[PDB]
Amino acid sequence: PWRSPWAISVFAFVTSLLGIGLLLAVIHSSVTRQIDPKGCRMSYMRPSYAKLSDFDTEHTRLASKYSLYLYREQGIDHDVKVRGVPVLFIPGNAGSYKQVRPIAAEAANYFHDVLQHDEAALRAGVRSLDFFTVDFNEDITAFHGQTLLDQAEYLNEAIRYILSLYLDPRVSERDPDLPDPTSVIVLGHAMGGIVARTMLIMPNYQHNSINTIITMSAPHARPPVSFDGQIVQTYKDINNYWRHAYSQKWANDNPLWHVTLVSIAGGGLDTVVPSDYASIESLVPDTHGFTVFTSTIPNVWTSMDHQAILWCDQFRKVIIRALFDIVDVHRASQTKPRAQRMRVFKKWFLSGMETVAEKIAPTSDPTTLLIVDDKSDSITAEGERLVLRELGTQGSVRAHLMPIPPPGSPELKRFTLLTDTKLDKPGENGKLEVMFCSVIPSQPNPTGPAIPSQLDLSKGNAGTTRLACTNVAPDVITLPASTRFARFPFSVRKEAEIPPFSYLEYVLDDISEHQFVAVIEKATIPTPGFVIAEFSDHSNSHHTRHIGLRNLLTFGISLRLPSNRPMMSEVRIPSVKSSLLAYNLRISALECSGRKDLFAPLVRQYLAEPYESKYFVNARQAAVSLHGVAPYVPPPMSREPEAEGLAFQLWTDPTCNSSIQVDLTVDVMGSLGKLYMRYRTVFAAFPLFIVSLVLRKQFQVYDSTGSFITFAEGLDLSLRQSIPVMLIVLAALTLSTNFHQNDLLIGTQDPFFLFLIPLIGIICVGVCTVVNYIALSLTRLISVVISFIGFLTVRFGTAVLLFLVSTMIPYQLAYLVACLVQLGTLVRAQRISSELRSPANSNFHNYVHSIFILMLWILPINLPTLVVWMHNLSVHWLTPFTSHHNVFSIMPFILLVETHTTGQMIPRTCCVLLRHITSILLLSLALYAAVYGVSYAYTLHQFVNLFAFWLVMVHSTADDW
Amino acid sequence: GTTS
Ligand SMILES: *NCCOP(=O)(O)OC[C@H]1O[C@H](O[C@@H]2[C@@H](OC[C@H]3O[C@H](O[C@H]4[C@H](O)[C@@H](N)[C@@H](O[C@@H]5[C@@H](O)[C@H](O)[C@@H](O)[C@@H](O)[C@H]5OP(=O)(O)OC[C@@H](COCCCCCCCCCCCCCCCCCC)OC(=O)CCC/C=C\C/C=C\C/C=C\C/C=C\CCCCC)O[C@@H]4CO)[C@@H](OP(=O)(O)OCCN)[C@@H](O)[C@@H]3O)O[C@H](CO)[C@@H](O)[C@@H]2O)[C@@H](O[C@H]2O[C@H](CO)[C@@H](O)[C@H](O)[C@@H]2O)[C@@H](O)[C@@H]1O
Ligand SMILES: CC(C)CCC[C@@H](C)[C@H]1CC[C@H]2[C@@H]3CC=C4C[C@@H](O)CC[C@]4(C)[C@H]3CC[C@]12C
Ligand SMILES: CC(C)CCC[C@@H](C)[C@H]1CC[C@H]2[C@@H]3CC=C4C[C@@H](O)CC[C@]4(C)[C@H]3CC[C@]12C
Ligand SMILES: CCCCCCCCCCCCCCCC(=O)O
């Protein structure tokens, strides 16, 4: 019986409704649930660009297509001359060379305002930053690999030109004693970070010409999409190059020995590039680089868009300060040595509470000698917190000396100090100064001249004990100000910014050589300010909750920290690692009896795996979203059991004498919406798993009964047996020194996330049903247009295609034209089937429609190459095409579409062997799309091309062509 | 002038 193409089973309709429903729930809860606060303040400047038009086609063939600019900030840069350190900014996929405005303007203003007057800094080798930016015509690099290689080659030539600029007296004004620059600092945004890394493997790379790469939101670990095979191959090349180079034992064999790469990720607000891909932990050892999120950068403490990471005011200030602390024009490479650069980058980008953090004060030179009476009024008893609720109560400079406990005890102990008042630098007068003091023996034992050592005498008597003291300002940890009037670690308005807190954390072994911690209260009149300092035991401050993921998701975890707890407490849940699960954290009200608390509770939600810490000021209710073990990224390196999972660091006022409760439960809808970033690219390949299984059932029934069923009927028959079985096979496949372990299927071999395979399968079933109905609607709409033209008329009245592809037409244009001709054939077939309603006309219509659906699900992969080609034609760039690849990638589709235009139905199918070949081919296509589809989506075109060729063979000689 |  004739069954309409529009009819659908209740089973297949309900399943498609759930698939579309689960798609809307994932999409909706990815834009509304667990969204980080936006805290970027807009930056304003006066942009200007000088085109370096002497860098032309004589230097590189790409100079007819690309351009190089020198950023000039009006009012500060009054001429086009280079006078400092060259910096190169590389924009991303369809980015602009004008996106260098904020970072280049901050650098121009900061040197004008501050540094050019700083004579010591100029004596140390600091100069202007010359910001060069490159115009790529908004070329789409992520979707084309030859574009990426062209950009890298152009930029190597551009670096040669830039370094030649500093040799010309008519273009460069510099001190004559300075060395000639031999390196450029590269700042790359998005795919620009990849061009920056690609630049070091290209054959025209000049050695030692790059040593500093900073990338903002660049997908280092993994290509964003795999629609082009050249992108995937270039990623393999650069990732292999880093891994092989840094795996060398001898530095002379390491080409990247002097290169530092710092990867900054926007975080959860970045919806263009997943922040999971920014992790370079599998590429760069910690001695040469790290991955940092903008939420952990001090004085930034916010997540950012892909585009906001460039123009954020707080972030641009920090990056410019870091760039100005590494430059050294006394060295031909215009930067400090690699270790010093790493130390500076850690200081400016990291929280300072990391394991890789370096403590300077414990083992540095003393900067003051403190003379204090022997009455020991200043010297307090061990085991007492020092709490200063106001500064300047007495009216004179005071010293509070806290004796450091002896190291005899076996358990680990820490000294922690928190204050809201800025700590004085050495040789400075302010409200407060903290310093590590060591007793100077009364015996005149010779030592350093102590000429830098200033002297503070607070003894005023004959006692006069002498202390040599080191200021601890080098190692101050900046914490967001947590007061009762604060809601976010940041402030979008500069006027409303609260000056941040100051925090010191030391292990007892680091400072055991000293005898005291001196908190020098220099204020005389009573001024607002608090200081809390104490020594605490690791047992009392650090709590670990060993709870499985199943129990955590079922019940949650709840803690009760006691009242007699330190200022800083840590709660670690080692079983919270996944980036796909989001939680809700609740901190109970601090019932401070009588007195108000010195400060509101501060929570630091942090991970050690990348450097991602998130701060919650005045914490009661926090959304816990972490970038941990992501699906398709290389596996995490080895770490100690004390640094696995998620940890919460808590600061509360310890004088309140009130216990605090910490609850952590799972956010189901937020966890569901976490899947959009991780699995959006599954939907260029995985719907082909469903389509191939439906076309397999359609051909099975045809070869057995001679009736070629509709796509909806094939879907109904496949959902009953074929699709569920092959999802079980995918699950079984997942359960069965390599950095590509995580490229296949769902990205993870973890058993907990096996439900993702049914989830993706059902969403793809819904998407395939919707696309089927869209194609049916489009066919009917074009048929209505044709019939309307016919009625308006009535009432008011070959074999050349091979030559085209070999010469100039990329096979993607031919594929689009083939899809259009197939749509025309589909319209003709539907019209004929409606007119005659024969069982033979229904077969041809259904067959042509299914082949059209198969062709249509490959078009997403081919479309990006058309926009690149059209763009290149607009720019007048011509790219030759290898005829062997073009012809063989399009001829089976051309022949199939021609055969369909002849109106010939596929011959019904040693004969059983030909019957089984179609089944095996479609099964292999389904399995291949499911398994290798995310990482190797460019191979699907070739595999579907092979299937189109077999169908041409069954058509020809399996019948009369 | 000034732009953003
Ligand atoms: N002052 C200082 C500075 O400032 P400014 O700048 O002003 O800023 C501020 C601002 O901002 C904003 O605005 C902005 C601006 O702009 C300006 C600019 O401009 C330019 O630039 C630009 C460029 O050009 C562009 N291009 C861009 O770029 C970028 C770059 O940069 C980067 O690098 C890269 O990466 C990228 O991103 C790029 O972009 P592109 O590429 O273009 O894009 C990409 C993206 C998008 O795309 C789209 C896509 C396509 C579509 C399609 C899709 C697909 C579809 C689906 C399917 C359908 C089909 C159907 C079927 C049927 C058939 C049958 C038959 O991408 C993305 O996004 C990705 C994602 C999405 C996609 C996809 C997805 C899909 C799918 C999926 C599904 C499913 C899955 C799920 C689930 C599953 C799972 C579960 C289970 C398991 O951008 C830039 C910007 O920056 C330049 O200029 P010039 O050049 O001159 O001009 C030219 C023009 N073009 C520069 O210079 C400037 O600056 O303004 C404007 C106006 O005019 C606007 O628009 C913009 O936006 C605003 O605000 C804002 O801001 C920021 C942004 O920016 C943020 O952050 C904040 O928040 C705010 O909102 C304003 O207001 C302001 O004022
Ligand atoms: C979740 C998926 C199914 C989204 C697609 C929904 C729309 C496009 C589909 C779902 C069910 C479909 C209907 C199912 C059955 C028939 C009867 C047939 O004689 C004419 C078309 C008609 C009336 C279909 C029109 C299109 C339809 C309403
Ligand atoms: C059967 C259906 C799904 C076919 C339609 C899918 C097509 C229209 C979509 C799917 C993914 C899309 C691409 C995704 C993103 C970009 C980046 C942008 O800078 C240029 C356009 C480009 C390259 C899109 C072109 C159109 C595209 C290829
Ligand atoms: C139905 C087909 C949907 C397929 C989903 C494709 C998702 C496209 C993702 C865009 C990749 C990022 C674009 C450039 C970003 C960059 O510069 O790194």
Author numbering:
A (entry chain A): 138 to 873, 895 to 955, 983 to 1094, 1102 to 1153
B (entry chain B): 1 to 4
Task: Give the article text.
Residing in the ER membrane, PGAP1 removes the inositol-linked acyl chain from nascent triacylated GPI-APs (dubbed GPI-AP3) to form the diacylated forms (GPI-AP2). In our quest to find stable proteins suitable for biochemical and structural studies, we identified PGAP1 from Chaetomium thermophilum (cPGAP1), which shares 20.7%/29.1% sequence identity and 33.8%/45.7% similarity with the human/yeast deacylase, respectively. Due to its higher model completeness (81% of its 1183 residues), the cPGAP1S327A structure is used here for structural description. cPGAP1 contains a transmembrane domain (TMD), a lipase domain with a typical α-β-α hydrolase architecture, and a third domain with two jelly-roll subdomains that show a classic β-sandwich fold. The lipase domain of cPGAP1 exhibits a typical α/β hydrolase fold, with an eight-stranded β-sheet sandwiched by α-helices.
Unlike H443N, S327A did not show activity even with prolonged reaction time in our FSEC assay. In addition, hPGAP1 S174A, the human counterpart of cPGAP1 S327A, showed no activity in cell-based FACS assays. Therefore, we co-expressed cPGAP1 S327A with TGP3, purified the complex similarly to cPGAP1 H443N, and determined its cryo-EM structure (dubbed cPGAP1S327A) to a global resolution of 2.66 Å. To our surprise, however, the density also supported the fitting of the products (TGP2 and PLM), rather than TGP3, as similarly reasoned for cPGAP1H443N. Consistent with the structural observation, a significant portion of TGP3 was hydrolyzed to TGP2 in the cryo-EM sample, as revealed by the FSEC assay. The discrepant results indicated that the S327A mutant became active during purification. Based on these results, we concluded that cPGAP1S327A also exists in a product-bound state. Despite the overall structure similarity, the two product-bound structures (cPGAP1H443N and cPGAP1S327A) exhibit notable differences in the positioning of the TGP2 sn-1 alkyl chain, offering insights into the processes of substrate entrance and product release. Conversely, in cPGAP1S327A, it undergoes a ~ 45° drawing compass rotation, shifting outward by 6 Å and detaching from the enzyme. In cPGAP1S327A, a blob of density fitting well for a cholesterol molecule occupies the 1-alkyl position of the TGP2 in cPGAP1H443N. In the two product-bound structures, TGP2 was built with a C18:0 (cPGAP1H443N) and a C20:4 (cPGAP1S327A) 2-acyl chain without causing clashes.
